[PDB]
Design a protein around this ligand. Sequence first.
Ligand SMILES: CCCCCCCC/C=C\CCCCCCCC(=O)OC[C@H](O)CO
Ligand SMILES: [Zn+2]
Length: 347
Amino acid sequence: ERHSCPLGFGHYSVVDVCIFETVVIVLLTFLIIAGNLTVIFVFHCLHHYTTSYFIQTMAYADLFVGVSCLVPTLSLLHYSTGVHESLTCQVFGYIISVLKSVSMWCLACISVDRYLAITKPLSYNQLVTPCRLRICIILIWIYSCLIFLPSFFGWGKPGYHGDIFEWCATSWLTSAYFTGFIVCLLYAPAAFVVCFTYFHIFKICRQHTKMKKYTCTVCGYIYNPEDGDPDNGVNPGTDFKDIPDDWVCPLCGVGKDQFEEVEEYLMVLFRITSVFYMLQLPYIIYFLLESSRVLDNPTLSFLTTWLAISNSFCNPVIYALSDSTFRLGLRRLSETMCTSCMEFLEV
Ligand SMILES: CCCCCCCC/C=C\CCCCCCCC(=O)OC[C@H](O)CO
Ligand SMILES: [Zn+2]
């Protein structure tokens, strides 16, 4: 299967061809499959519930991005089936664009859900239900498929996700009509949805100055400033900063040094949202310029394409690494291996 391998410009040879492209794809295919499979076995096999479902969905969306990315890696690894390249780069580029819309929308629905919880706190549970959230999921899956369905009916190229394959990078051409359609009906709406919700959510929060929770890095005790530690002289309504240095963890006795601020779940979702929408921003700028024929650059086409695909890997990393309990799981894991390493070494 022939590939478009523009990196290492003019330095490639019969043994060196498609090496920088192959490391990027093979790493991302691995990091996205592994990174989401860990998240769905730890948290998706008990938070704010509606968001827990949008996050669960975009976990399977991001996993199947990397599962699809097994196609380029195996073609780049000289494994082939007796099927035209024009077809496998047409199907893959469709599947990825759709999955990329499913995750992009999932982050737009979380943003609205958190908007509605904060703006209509009386009505929130009366607007959101287990049937409404379930019909909202399938409408993302239907809408995403239908914005990238024209590619199968001669409207043009819906992205550069298959431009690693030769046929898609030189034979299929993006049409400004099709690109404008996608941008206006998918990229522009989600971007404005998440810009309006997170602007107003932080507009409201900036007035209401809530006191920060802190967790014990050793055992996982949460100092909740609304409760305090009344047994040990700590009045409720005292921030962690105000407790004297003398104070110690009630569950294990470690000092105020061993306590990290518990990050707010909204702020985690704003980070996942800003990383995701910023990692595919270069790719939409290139997608607009090339469709407008103001620019053609296969290297800029490849970097922005895989910089976007990489946000299927950042999603599970921001989510698990912003959570205090997952982190503790890893520190207890290292110790389990260490004490067993001290033990297996007793010989
Ligand atoms: C990836 C597109 C821009 C990402 C911006 C956010 C991340 C910043 C990281 C690197 C920027 C510097 C690397 C830019 C490499 C562009 C390749 C290029 O411009 O090609 C040069 C030459 O013209 C070919 O013919
Ligand atoms: Zn403790």
